[PDB]
Amino acid sequence: MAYKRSQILICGGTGCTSSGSMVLVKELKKELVKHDILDEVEVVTTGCFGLCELGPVVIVYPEGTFYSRVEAADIPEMVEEHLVKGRPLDRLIYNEKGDGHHPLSINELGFFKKQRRIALANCGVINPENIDEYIGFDGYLALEKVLLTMSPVDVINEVKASGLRGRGGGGFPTGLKWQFAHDAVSEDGIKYVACNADEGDPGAFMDRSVLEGDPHAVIEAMAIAGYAVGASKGYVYVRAEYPIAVNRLQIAIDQAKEYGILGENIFETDFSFDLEIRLGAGAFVCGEETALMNSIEGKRGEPRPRPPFPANKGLFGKPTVLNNVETYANIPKIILNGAEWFASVGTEKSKGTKVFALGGKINNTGLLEIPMGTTLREIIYEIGGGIPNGKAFKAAQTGGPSGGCLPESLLDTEIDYDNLIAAGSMMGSGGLIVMDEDNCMVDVARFFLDFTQDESCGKCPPCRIGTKRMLEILERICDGKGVEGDIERLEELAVGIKSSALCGLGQTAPNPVLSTIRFFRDEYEAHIRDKKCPAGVCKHLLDFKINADTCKGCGICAKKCPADAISGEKKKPYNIDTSKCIKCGACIEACPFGSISKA
Amino acid sequence: MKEITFKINGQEMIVPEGTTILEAARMNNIDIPTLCYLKDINEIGACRMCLVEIAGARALQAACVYPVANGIEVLTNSPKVREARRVNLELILSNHNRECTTCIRSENCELQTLATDLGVSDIPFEGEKSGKLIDDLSTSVVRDESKCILCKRCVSVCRDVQSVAVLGTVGRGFTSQVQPVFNKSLADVGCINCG
Amino acid sequence: MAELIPVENLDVVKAIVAEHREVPGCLMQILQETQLKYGYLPLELQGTIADELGIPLTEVYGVATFYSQFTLKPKGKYKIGICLGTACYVRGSQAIIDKVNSVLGTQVGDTTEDGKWSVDATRCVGACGLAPVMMINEEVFGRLTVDEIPGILEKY
Numbered sequence: 001m002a003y004k005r006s007q008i009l010i011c012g013g014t015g016c017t018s019s020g021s022m023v024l025v026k027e028l029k030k031e032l033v034k035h036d037i038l039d040e041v042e043v044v045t046t047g048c049f050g051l052c053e054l055g056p057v058v059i060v061y062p063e064g065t066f067y068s069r070v071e072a073a074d075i076p077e078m079v080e081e082h083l084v085k086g087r088p089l090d091r092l093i094y095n096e097k098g099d100g101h102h103p104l105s106i107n108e109l110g111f112f113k114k115q116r117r118i119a120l121a122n123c124g125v126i127n128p129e130n131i132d133e134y135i136g137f138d139g140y141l142a143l144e145k146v147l148l149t150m151s152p153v154d155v156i157n158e159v160k161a162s163g164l165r166g167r168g169g170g171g172f173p174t175g176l177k178w179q180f181a182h183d184a185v186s187e188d189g190i191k192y193v194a195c196n197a198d199e200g201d202p203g204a205f206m207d208r209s210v211l212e213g214d215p216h217a218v219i220e221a222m223a224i225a226g227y228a229v230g231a232s233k234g235y236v237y238v239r240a241e242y243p244i245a246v247n248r249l250q251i252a253i254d255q256a257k258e259y260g261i262l263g264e265n266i267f268e269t270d271f272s273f274d275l276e277i278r279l280g281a282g283a284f285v286c287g288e289e290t291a292l293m294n295s296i297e298g299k300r301g302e303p304r305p306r307p308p309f310p311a312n313k314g315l316f317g318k319p320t321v322l323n324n325v326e327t328y329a330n331i332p333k334i335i336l337n338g339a340e341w342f343a344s345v346g347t348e349k350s351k352g353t354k355v356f357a358l359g360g361k362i363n364n365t366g367l368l369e370i371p372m373g374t375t376l377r378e379i380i381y382e383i384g385g386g387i388p389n390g391k392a393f394k395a396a397q398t399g400g401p402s403g404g405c406l407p408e409s410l411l412d413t414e415i416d417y418d419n420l421i422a423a424g425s426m427m428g429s430g431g432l433i434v435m436d437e438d439n440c441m442v443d444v445a446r447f448f449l450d451f452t453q454d455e456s457c458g459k460c461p462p463c464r465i466g467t468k469r470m471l472e473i474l475e476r477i478c479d480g481k482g483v484e485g486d487i488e489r490l491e492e493l494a495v496g497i498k499s500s501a502l503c504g505l506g507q508t509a510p511n512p513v514l515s516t517i518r519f520f521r522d523e524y525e526a527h528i529r530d531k532k533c534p535a536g537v538c539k540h541l542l543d544f545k546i547n548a549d550t551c552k553g554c555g556i557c558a559k560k561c562p563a564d565a566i567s568g569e570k571k572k573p574y575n576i577d578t579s580k581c582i583k584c585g586a587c588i589e590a591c592p593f594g595s596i597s598k599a
Numbered sequence: 600m601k602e603i604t605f606k607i608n609g610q611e612m613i614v615p616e617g618t619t620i621l622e623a624a625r626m627n628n629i630d631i632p633t634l635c636y637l638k639d640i641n642e643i644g645a646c647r648m649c650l651v652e653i654a655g656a657r658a659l660q661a662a663c664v665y666p667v668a669n670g671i672e673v674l675t676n677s678p679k680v681r682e683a684r685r686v687n688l689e690l691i692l693s694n695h696n697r698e699c700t701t702c703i704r705s706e707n708c709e710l711q712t713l714a715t716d717l718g719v720s721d722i723p724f725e726g727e728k729s730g731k732l733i734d735d736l737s738t739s740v741v742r743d744e745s746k747c748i749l750c751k752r753c754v755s756v757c758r759d760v761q762s763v764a765v766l767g768t769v770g771r772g773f774t775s776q777v778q779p780v781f782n783k784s785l786a787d788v789g790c791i792n793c794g
Numbered sequence: 795m796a797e798l799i800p801v802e803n804l805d806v807v808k809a810i811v812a813e814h815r816e817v818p819g820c821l822m823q824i825l826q827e828t829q830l831k832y833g834y835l836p837l838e839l840q841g842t843i844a845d846e847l848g849i850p851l852t853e854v855y856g857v858a859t860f861y862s863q864f865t866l867k868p869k870g871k872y873k874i875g876i877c878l879g880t881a882c883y884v885r886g887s888q889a890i891i892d893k894v895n896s897v898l899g900t901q902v903g904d905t906t907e908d909g910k911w912s913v914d915a916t917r918c919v920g921a922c923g924l925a926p927v928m929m930i931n932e933e934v935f936g937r938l939t940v941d942e943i944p945g946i947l948e949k950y
């Protein structure tokens with residue numbers, strides 16, 4: 001390998017490519033030709049760096065200088081000012097405190113201080129299209145130990161000693177799944193495995209981050225996986241609408257065939273195991289364990305009732321295993337550094353760290369990977385940089401539609417299995433969404449309730465009929481046609497539906513309604529009795545009032561009223577007919593003085 | 600052949616493996632409701648009326664296609680499972696046309712028998728149904744999808760026993776209707792008029 | 795972008811069917827390359843597929859109508875997409891929807907007569923960190939507001 005004085009990494013994440021990261025990479029190597037330092041300066045397309053708020057991200061090694069909000073208007077400057085002159089520019093360095101101190105390392109900042117990258121240890125660091133960078137950074141060492149010395153019996157003993165439990169949302173020990181696959185004996189001795197990479201819940205975007213960071217570690221765990229249970233054939237499942245990710249992953253398959261890693265007679269052993277891609281196109285219901293089984297076989301995506309388990313009957317009557325990718329990622333970390341390394345972090349019930357993806361009104365937007373046992377209060381304030389613009393935090397939603405809201409009374413909640421279920425919510429994929437006082441919490445429950453109606457697979461009658469029959473109760477409140485006692489009609493369906501569901505949506509569908517009523521009962525009464533939205537969001541429950549002091553009385557809003565509910569004389573503030581307009585709101589923006597407010 | 604030992608309501612049974620609790624309890628003179636099931640052809644259990652609680656389970660399971668297992672205890676007279684059956688009953692009845700005076704089937708409709716079977720009284724609900732389209736253009740069979748409650752027994756029997764299978768399920772949610780292909784009529788496709 | 799082959803050309807269909815027979819469960823994959831090569835699914839085309847496979851129309855038509863990523867209608871030149879995820883919604887994406895309906899004059903899920911502006915319901919492109927998110931063909935605009943909507947719409 002040729003020695004490089006300087007090394008520069010570029011973020012290839014989804015958020016960075018949205019801003020035009022491919023334009024910058026094209027321009028970055030253009031100036032390397034011009035200034036003739038191309039053979040000394042290395043440009044590498046790496047994965048996401050966990051902070052897409054500051055995207056695109058340019059870090060020059062060995063300096064380790066962080067650049068944020070770099071755009072195409074300053075391409076030739078950064079080549080000359082740092083790669084030639086050897087000095088940084090203070091204006092593009094991120095400054096959390098604002099006092100002029102520059103962090104030397106990424107973990108020195110408030111965003112990365114509590115971020116333990118274990119599964120993401122090498123993701124975002126290596127070149128995924130370069131097989132040499134991974135093997136030079138301690139890669140493919142796990143296979144050389146297990147294919148020569150370690151028995152398939154012994155490896156599942158390591159997992160239950162590690163105490164790993166699945167982060168797919170179910171909270172089940174992983175090593176039991178492994179033993180539930182090993183004991184089953186098929187007629188022809190044929191075994192298959194599966195891989196879940198299908199994320200479709202809103203706010204969850206961490207699933208292909210390991211795919212956009214490192215395809216090599218994903219397939220390496222697959223060879224480990226087939227070695228334990230004796231699998232000769234494997235499938236992996238992806239979505240079609242990620243066009244960048246689908247191309248590069250198939251390229252990494254070729255290098256596995258080029259060295260002989262994936263296939264037959266793997267590393268001069270008797271182990272043979274191969275992969276090829278399956279092309280899904282973004283069905284969130286396919287993420288169910290047996291809905292993906294009949295999706296691949298080409299039938300309707302019906303979720304097959306359990307039992308019989310996916311463990312004993314699967315592809316062509318042969319045993320299979322179902323799990324998501326990020327739980328496969330720490331498996332080489334188990335064998336290289338010991339199971340007690342995994343057990344060194346976390347509480348006594350479950351061990352290790354957990355990976356999340358944040359969203360909502362937050363100052364910094366990105367990924368977050370916290371060791372288990374951390375309070376919720378620490379998450380919003382010093383990790384996310386606090387609430388932007390001084391707003392008032394009301395409730396924080398986890399798991400998207402699959403979970404519930406966490407109000408201000410539960411900031412010292414230890415986020416784990418037994419506490420948040422006792423708080424009536426589940427983590428799922430780990431999406432975190434923060435709400436403030438600026439939006440009404442009534443109709444946002446209908447927003448997650450919008451998701452479940454348009455995605456329901458249509459088999460069980462509650463997840464067909466009971467869903468839309470539960471919308472009209474909310475919207476008649478949302479337009480002011482409701483009556484008292486309708487919220488107690490909601491509580492009739494509250495326990496009926498959850499005990500009467502087959503599809504995985506049905507158990508977890510009404511829980512957003514369940515979470516909010518036991519804290520926010522009073523604000524419904526404002527919607528029901530006072531007929532007023534506290535946030536002024538519900539369109540049919542809001543009215544406009546002008547202020548006499550600030551209004552000029554010019555009459556620009558009088559031209560923009562389609563229902564002509566405003567009238568009067570010039571040079572004086574006008575009169576508003578509340579019942580006559582359709583509450584469209586076209587008049588509030590047309591005033592150049594901002595004289596119209598929501599009541 | 601394998602022998603399976605299980606106790607229902609405290610009563611121990613030895614059965615051949617693969618038989619389910621429905622017919623085993625029918626052999627023991629115990630009845631479980633059914634709309635979905637028919638022998639040898641349709642075992643999907645989408646009716647969600649045949650619920651029963653199984654000790655050691657997270658949530659409830661339908662007795663129609665739940666396989667038997669050794670050492671399991673079954674109790675069929677808890678208040679919760681009765682409540683579940685009743686609430687599924689009014690959620691079905693809020694879809695399925697209520698002018699059962701002028702139905703053709705009239706006397707021995709299964710839904711009337713189940714409505715009297717669970718003894719439901721109150722319908723507190725107002726809702727919106729499927730579309731009302733009369734396909735009175737064929738020669739023998741007229742469908743009124745305003746009554747159809749998505750049994751999938753029709754499509755199954757036309758699929759396997761007939762081996763004709765000119766019917767399918769389309770749309771999502773309320774648009775999920777059983778239909779012929781291309782939104783045509785039965786006279787416009789190759790229906791055998793088997794009966 | 796390559797040309798979309800007109801519907802009267804049946805030889806490509808049978809060539810792809812003869813190519814993709816041996817793999818199990820080939821319905822989903824064969825329908826997606828027909829979507830890539832033709833753009834939309836008119837009735838005769840999927841019927842010829844049922845003739846070639848020797849399997850009847852019901853399951854093919856059902857899986858055509860089950861997934862929203864498959865179309866039964868010819869589509870316009872340019873696609874219009876608002877990220878309808880929670881991260882984009884919570885900033886006020888309903889204002890984005892209402893402004894789109896106001897400027898274009900057609901409701902959501904309606905195709906304009908020109909064959910140029912065409913809108914649908916895209917749930918998440920995955921780039922939710924730059925909310926609000928607006929996608930057209932392979933171009934994504936982020937951290938926008940209602941003000942930027944006519945200027946971006948008038949770019950195309």
Ligand SMILES: Cc1cc2nc3c(=O)[nH]c(=O)nc-3n(C[C@H](O)[C@H](O)[C@H](O)COP(=O)(O)O)c2cc1C
Binds near residue numbers: 169
């Ligand atoms: C509709 C649906 C979608 C799902 N999607 C996912 C997913 O994207 N990722 C995931 O890990 N689990 C998903 N699950 C849960 C999986 O069934 C399963 O729990 C997971 O693959 C195994 O992890 P566990 O060990 O925690 O159960 C989904 C379930 C349903 C019903």
Ligand code: SF4
Binds near residue numbers: 303457459503504
């Ligand atoms: S909950 Fe019922 S209707 Fe919804 S997807 Fe599951 S089985 Fe189908």
Ligand code: SF4
Binds near residue numbers: 554596
């Ligand atoms: S546009 Fe503003 S200043 Fe003019 S009349 Fe209306 S509210 Fe008053």
Ligand code: SF4
Binds near residue numbers: 582587
């Ligand atoms: S909200 Fe709309 S209809 Fe009502 S007064 Fe204002 S501009 Fe007119």
Ligand code: SF4
Binds near residue numbers: 695696704708
């Ligand atoms: S299905 Fe027919 S017979 Fe049964 S209640 Fe309805 S109308 Fe009457």
Ligand code: SF4
Binds near residue numbers: 746747749750753
């Ligand atoms: S015709 Fe309709 S009501 Fe009768 S079995 Fe078929 S789906 Fe059910």
Ligand code: SF4
Binds near residue numbers: 763766
């Ligand atoms: S009558 Fe026609 S639709 Fe009915 S089962 Fe016979 S062939 Fe099928």
Ligand code: FES
Binds near residue numbers: 015016050
């Ligand atoms: S998307 Fe660029 S750092 Fe994450």
Ligand code: FES
Binds near residue numbers: 664
């Ligand atoms: S027949 Fe429907 S639940 Fe068994």
Ligand code: FES
Binds near residue numbers: 878879880882917
């Ligand atoms: S939240 Fe999914 S695309 Fe914006």
Ligand SMILES: [Zn+2]
Binds near residue numbers: 441527534537
């Ligand atoms: Zn409100």
